[PDB]
Amino acid sequence: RWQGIIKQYKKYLPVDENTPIVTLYEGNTPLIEADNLARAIGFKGKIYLKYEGLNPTGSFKDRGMTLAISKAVEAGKRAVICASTGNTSASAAAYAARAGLRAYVLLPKGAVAIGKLSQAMIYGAKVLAIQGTFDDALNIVRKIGENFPVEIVNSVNPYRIEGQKTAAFEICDTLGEAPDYHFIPVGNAGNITAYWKGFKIYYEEGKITKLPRMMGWQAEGAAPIVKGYPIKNPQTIATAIKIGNPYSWKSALKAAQESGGKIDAVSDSEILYAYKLIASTEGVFCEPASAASVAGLIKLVREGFFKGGEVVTCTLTGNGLKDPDTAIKVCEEPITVPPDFDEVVKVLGF
Ligand X SMILES: *Cc1c(COP(=O)(O)O)cnc(C)c1O
- Binding residue positions for pyridoxal 5'-phosphate: 59, 87, 187-191, 317
Interface segment toward a copy of itself; rule CB under 8 A; list 97-105, 203-211, 212-220, 298-306? 97-105
Determine, following the binding rule CB under 8 A, whether residue 154 of this chain makes contact with a copy of itself.
no
- Least separation in angstroms between CB 59 and a copy of itself: 10
Quickly list H helices, 1-126: 5-8, 35-41, 62-74, 87-99, 114-122
Selected from 55, 59, 85, 157, the binder of ligand X by CB under 6 A is 59
Q: What b-and-e string marks burial along 49-65, b requiring 16 or more CB atoms within 10 Å of the CB?
A: bbbbbebbbbbbbbbbb
Q: What distance in Å separates the CA atoms of residue 94 and residue 62, rounded to the nearest whole number?
A: 9
Would you say 166 or 193 has its CB closer to a copy of itself? 166
Report the partner that residue 77 touches, choosing among ligand X, a copy of itself, none (CB closer than 5 to 8 A by kind).
none
Nearer Cβ to ligand X, position 30 or 45? 30
Closest alpha carbon to 43 in 262, 313, 260, 265: 313
Query: Based on CB atoms, which residue is closest to ligand X, 73 or 263?
Result: 263
> Of ligand X, a copy of itself, none, which one does residue 186 interact with (CB within 5 to 8 Å by kind)?
ligand X
Query: Which range touches ligand X (CB under 6 A), out of 2-10, 41-49, 100-108, 180-188?
Result: 180-188
CA-to-CA distance for 79 and 40, rounded, in angstroms? 48
Distance, CA of 246 to CA of 186 (rounded, Å)? 9
Options 10-18, 99-107, 214-222, 230-238: segment touching a copy of itself (CB under 8 A): 99-107
Our finding on whether 241 is near ligand X (CB under 6 A) is yes
106-145: contacts with a copy of itself (CB under 8 A): 106-107, 109, 112, 114-115, 117-119, 121-124, 126-133, 136-137, 139-140, 143-144
How many Cα atoms within 13 Å fall on the side-chain side of residue 185?
Answer: 34
Residue 115 to residue 113: CA distance in whole angstroms: 6
Q: Which does 240 bind (CB under 5 to 8 A by kind): ligand X, a copy of itself, none?
A: ligand X
Q: Cα separation of 182 and 104, whole Å?
A: 35
Q: What is the DSSP string of 225-254?
A: HHHTS--SS---S-GGG--SS-TTHHHHHH
Min dist CB 343 to ligand X, Å, is: 31
Distance CA 278, CA 153 (A): 32
Residues of this chain that bind ligand X (CB under 6 A):
59, 61, 87, 185-191, 240-241, 287, 289-290, 317-318
